[PDB]
Amino acid sequence: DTAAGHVTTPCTEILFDLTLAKHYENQIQAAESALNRNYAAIRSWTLLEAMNRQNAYTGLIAYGIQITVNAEQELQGPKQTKLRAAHALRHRAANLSAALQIQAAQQATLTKPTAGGAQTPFSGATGTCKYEGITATAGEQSCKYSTEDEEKINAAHMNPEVMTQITTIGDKYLTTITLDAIAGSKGNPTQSSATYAEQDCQDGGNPGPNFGGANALGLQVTKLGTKATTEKTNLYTAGGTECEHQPGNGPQKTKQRLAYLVCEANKAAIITPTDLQTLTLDALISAPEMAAIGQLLKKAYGQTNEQFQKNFIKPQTTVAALMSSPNSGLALAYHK
């Protein structure tokens, strides 16, 4: 758990969450790229069949259609499982970034108070100093990662075999405002302490800084901000086979839902089919589907790969760009 072991702060959880989402997204993108390459190969061989050789080209088209349509169908499930996780991880990272900005508002700006006597919620006070609209805001926050952060929290460290837990920021960071506050009194503050120059309530003597007047009353919000904590959540049950935190068994925390989805995404294996455009002879001969489609296989495609390449892989003004161009169909219709 190199990557998750490096999550110790809101910023580094954000980086883990975004980096794992993109990892799942790249896995799907890679598989879909492989499919489109295979469909471009089939279109390429379709034009060549239109130009013994015909049956051989059709053996490739049939083999290509079979394994590519199979893998496209086999992909949809793992695709959805992985995407559900990538969406939730990006959603969580968005959440954490928003809470980060708010928890950065740690300095308060006081308003002009208003002095009074007894009033809610100090019915027994002889003096009160009431503030409305005290605010706290921070400049735009940004996470700045070190070189090691991005080396540790990296798709290279997110293979399923090495992942057993996630680390998340505790919920209080996303739900709770925390602050320190202090009241100060001097003399006999009342409703007549209506000199507000120092953003407190003063009267008597010479009002001024540091409770200069005879009677003073005020407060300050000296600090705001909720401390982040971290929490570990395992992906698998004790035995290590099943995903923990299955939904449908009672209320769950965010970390539990995320851990379930990441576990299922890690287990959703993608079957990548053979790359048709770099296919070798021994790959086609050894392919089990080519038994039903077809020593005889060699007779038709070649007994050396150097031959199979030259006849079926290397071609020719281009077969591949044409059959994925605005003139793909006209090219096949003319030659047919």
Ligand X SMILES: *[C@@H]1O[C@H](CO)[C@@H](O[C@@H]2O[C@H](CO)[C@@H](O[C@@H]3O[C@H](CO[C@H]4O[C@H](CO)[C@@H](O)[C@H](O)[C@@H]4O)[C@@H](O)[C@H](O[C@H]4O[C@H](CO)[C@@H](O)[C@H](O)[C@@H]4O)[C@@H]3O)[C@H](O)[C@H]2NC(C)=O)[C@H](O)[C@H]1NC(C)=O
Binding region for ligand X (CB under 6 A): 88, 91-92, 94-95, 97-98, 100-101, 140-143, 251, 254
DSSP string, 205-251: E---TTT-EEEEEEEEEEEE-PPP-EEEEESB-TTSSSBSS-SSSS-
Q: What is the C-alpha to C-alpha distance for residues 82 and 22, in angstroms, rounded to an integer?
A: 10
Closest distance to a second copy from the beta carbon of 282 (Å): 20
With beta carbons less than 8 A apart as the criterion, state whether 229 and 237 touch.
no
With beta carbons less than 8 A apart as the criterion, state whether 246 and 261 touch.
no
Closest distance to a second copy from the beta carbon of 137 (Å): 5
> CB under 5 to 8 A by kind: which of a second copy, ligand X, none does 324 bind?
a second copy
With beta carbons less than 8 A apart as the criterion, state whether 153 and 7 touch.
yes
> CB under 5 to 8 A by kind: which of a second copy, ligand X, none does 329 bind?
a second copy
Nearest residue (CB) to ligand X, 262 versus 319: 262
Nearest residue (CB) to ligand X, 12 versus 195: 12
Stretch that binds a second copy, among 7-15, 21-29, 43-51, 235-243 (CB under 8 A): 43-51
x/- mask, a second copy, residues 76-95, rule CB under 8 A, reads --------------xx--xx
Q: Which of residues 22, 37, 130, 267 is near a second copy by CB under 8 A?
A: 130
Nearest residue (CB) to a second copy, 132 versus 161: 132
Q: Tokens at residue 124, please? A: 């027994």
Burial of 38 (0-12, 13-18, 19+ CB in 10 A): buried
Nearest residue (CB) to ligand X, 231 versus 282: 231
Q: Which of residues 29, 30, 98, 282 is near a second copy by CB under 8 A?
A: 98
Please report whether residue 58 would count as binding a second copy according to CB under 8 A: yes
Binders of a second copy among residues 159 to 178 (CB under 8 A) are 172, 174-178
Please report whether residue 37 would count as binding a second copy according to CB under 8 A: no
Please report whether residue 66 would count as binding a second copy according to CB under 8 A: yes
Closest distance to ligand X from the beta carbon of 84 (Å): 11
Nearest residue (CB) to ligand X, 209 versus 251: 251
Please report whether residue 302 would count as binding a second copy according to CB under 8 A: no
x/- mask, a second copy, residues 258-287, rule CB under 8 A, reads ------------------------------
> CB under 5 to 8 A by kind: which of a second copy, ligand X, none does 292 bind?
a second copy
First to last CA, the chain: 58
- Which of 2, 325, 330, 320 is closest to 148 using CA atoms? 2
- Which of 232, 230, 246, 245 is closest to 1 using CA atoms? 232
State which H helix or E strand residue 114 sits in. strand 114-116
Nearest residue (CB) to a second copy, 130 versus 267: 130
Binders of a second copy among residues 191 to 230 (CB under 8 A) are 209-212, 216-222, 224, 226
Please report whether residue 320 would count as binding a second copy according to CB under 8 A: no
Phi first, then psi: give them for residue 210, nearest 5 degrees.
55, 45
Q: Tokens at residue 82, please? A: 């992985």
> CB under 5 to 8 A by kind: which of ligand X, a second copy, none does 88 bind?
ligand X
Buried b (16+ CB within 10 A) or exposed e, 64-73: bebbbeebbe
Please report whether residue 16 would count as binding a second copy according to CB under 8 A: no
Q: What is the C-alpha to C-alpha distance for residues 46 and 294, in angstroms, rounded to an integer?
A: 18
Q: Tokens at residue 286, please? A: 């050894």
- The structure tokens 């009431």 sit at 130
DSSP string, 99-112: HHHHHT---EEPPP
